[PDB]
Amino acid sequence: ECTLRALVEEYNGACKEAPKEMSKQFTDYNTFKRYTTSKHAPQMRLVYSVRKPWPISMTPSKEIPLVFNGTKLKDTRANIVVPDYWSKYGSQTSLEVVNAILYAEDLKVQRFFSTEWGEIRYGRMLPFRKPVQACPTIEEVNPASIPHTLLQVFCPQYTTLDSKRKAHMGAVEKLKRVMEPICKVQTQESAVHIARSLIDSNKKWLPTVVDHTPRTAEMAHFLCSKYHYVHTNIRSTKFSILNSDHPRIEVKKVFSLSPDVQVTIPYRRFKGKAKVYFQNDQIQGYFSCTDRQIDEIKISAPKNAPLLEPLLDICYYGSFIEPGFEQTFGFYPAGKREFVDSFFMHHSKDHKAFLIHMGLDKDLSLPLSPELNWKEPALSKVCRVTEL
């Protein structure tokens, strides 16, 4: 493929032309990417620039230099009128190309002309600015896994297992479907920008008189104001108890950072023996439960499937693993929310606690692997896990 030949030639030219710069470290890219001596703003030099004899800096192509006494090409530099000439008596492209060249904009326009606006009413209502998600997204993605989701969408082969783990699945598939044509027609940087704008959850301060849904927050500069308001129109898995000797307790532990400040974060745990049938998409099965340990787990999962998050859901259900329910994470939790999230991030980055709690077996007949994957070859297998 000639693209590889061009890449090799360009690399050789860069090495020969710029030896010292090529010898810099790769991590210095974040420094020398923005290397420019350009120093306000070019808004001043616009009215004069557009009226220059040859403002447009075009590339060598098939453009008529003189049409009806045009003088549109000097051979490059082009006249200001050639952008207008490419709107009539020019070359056209396929309907798929024009449909796929803009996708997010079509979604934003379609949402605007799809809502039944009510009757505008006027009053002394006072808006208070609150942080709400800017625009609707195709999927609910946290602001931390967006780069990893983008890496999985665009460069699946250049990634790491940790990056895949800290990436929202499901959104990747839809993004791939919606951006397979866009990446083909536009540039890589523009494709990345459109993708992030599709999935980014950027909390922006907006006027708020009533609770704004993500749809309403996008169009809020006219819905509400100081004098008027027009009115518009564990994670995913689930659990079910089958045989519980005693009912679930509501014990809570208090964390005392100082004698004057305390927090009450309650953790929910079983007692005696229990059996819960956990269901999550393709993952299904029931596992025996102890006071705080696990006796047996039965899982029915597709071959070579990621089985880390369902087990983390299981661990939170019974407060099984210690380092996230009694022993703090090294810092005083301000509230229950971030404690819930920080548990699922720390214990997803590393899962040593689960392996220590359940133990390791030296045989290979056990299906589940220490990397929390279903039915894969490994040098060792986690114990006390079977299939239905």
Binding site: Q25, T27, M44, R45, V47, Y48, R51, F113, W117, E119, I120, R121, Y122, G123, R124, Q157, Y158, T159, T160, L161, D162, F222, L223, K226, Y227, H228, V230, D350, L355, L360, P370, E371, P377, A378, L379, S380, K381
Partner: protein
Amino acid sequence: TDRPDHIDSRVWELSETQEDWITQVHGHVRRVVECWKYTICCLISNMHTHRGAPQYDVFKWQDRSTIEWICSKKKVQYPERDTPDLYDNERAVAYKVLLVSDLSDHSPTSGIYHDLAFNLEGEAEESCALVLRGSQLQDIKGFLCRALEWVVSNNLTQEVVETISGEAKLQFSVGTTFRTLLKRDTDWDVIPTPRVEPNVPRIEGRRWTQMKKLPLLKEKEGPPSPWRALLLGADSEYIVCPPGTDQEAISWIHSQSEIECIRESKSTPASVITCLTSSLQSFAEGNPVRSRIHEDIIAFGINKKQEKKQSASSSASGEWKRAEYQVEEMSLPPWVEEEMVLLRSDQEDNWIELEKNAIYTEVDGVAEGLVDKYIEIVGRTKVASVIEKWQIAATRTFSQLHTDRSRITACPIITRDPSGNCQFWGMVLLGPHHVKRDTDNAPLLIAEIMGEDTEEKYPKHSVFSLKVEEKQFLLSLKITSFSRNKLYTFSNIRRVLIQPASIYSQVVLSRAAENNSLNLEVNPEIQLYLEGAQRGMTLYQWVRMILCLEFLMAIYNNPQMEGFLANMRRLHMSRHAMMERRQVFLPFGSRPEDKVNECIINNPIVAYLAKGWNSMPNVYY
């Protein structure tokens, strides 16, 4: 921090940029341990092949992308922080080398990969010894023997065992020489520790005084302030011309014109009429560029810098002293009220033609209706025509002031009415401008049409009688140098419509919000403190006066105006507080009027606003 003898140069160069060695505890030793592990891996994987491919694929210190590619072909994936050092393709296992001080505590780290245990003297663990060949063990033992003799030569044995026991310890140490430099200009050390018991002293402060009455500003006494602006403002008239382009109108004016001087000012000599007539002719032919003429050195200040430097250096009498600059103090000119009244006069045309935006929702209709009614209120006014003249003049002057031309450029101020007739508001005349910064001043020769001549108001403008088609109009002529930034910001002078629009919009919306109904022709009574008495005008007249006052404040904006407004915002707030029957208290040395009085020197509208402040009830009781 040099390369150990037992470590190859390639290994050291590879290990240089793999981790931040300088900022870790026991640096230059953890790096040596990692180099030991990498060398052990290389010796284990030394030219050994199996099934036509190398038996051992080392993974330590390799790019993550190619590691993932190799692992994908081998049907296995590994995490970032627990990746194996090497993989045994012969029996499909992964091994990571782990130097240990004692071989008794084998301690299998994890089931993902079997470990390889080696001591500091050479002997390996039984599992890793029986899984590998004898030559590999011999080579590793020899390499570890050389490493151990190097260590005991430089007695880092405790450091080596500490690095083996630990994993990573971040640190940042400041040297002894840097410490002496740092503590040159301070009484404490790098880590402050004063020998004082913490306590908050009880200090006896002053008492807070109530603002019983609002402060009175200090009116300044002196000669009345002249009109110092680019254009003539409210005294700006236009000459009707037959429909056509700018060149046709200029040619017609040049053909029908008789120029006689009425008032001559020393600031602008009457001889600079010749260059203006030459510019009229040149623009009439079609080229608005002319060669320099004799009556231009005293018109555009050519060689004035060198001439004035030579004149000043001719005397050179006195002694060096600090440069002291005095700003002349001026009183309130009588013409401020005249301009305010004239700028409110009603014209025939609308003078504000802005394209109406589209309407798709009910909210869009309300906004467009409000904007249309606001434009109707402040459109048929003289101030709108003056704003349009200022915009046209500033834009035409700026468009021709981007190169470094050394020849006179012509930028006529011509506007066109809806019918199509040209309107000669005046003319800007560029001079030789070798501009280099946005703050540099470019010479100009403003020639514009008056409506009334007043020597005190225009001490520098020269007035010439102009006769055009049985009609006689005055003609101003002033020499002015004006900067790039000022021309740019006056090219968008139409932005001044925003503030009166905001006031009108808030009044209308508050009226519509008291009840629940949008009227759009509400004209309430706005009570104001006019001439002391509380007489109220209409909303339409108030917005009209607000626009004129803001336009005057814009073209007369200077540091005095900025400081005056900034320091009077708080006084306006205090006045509102006392209106709301509220008490205002001040600290000991509180003189809020002092911060305002220092900004009143010679600005006309600043003095006018000061008089407006000192035309109000003092005590609100």
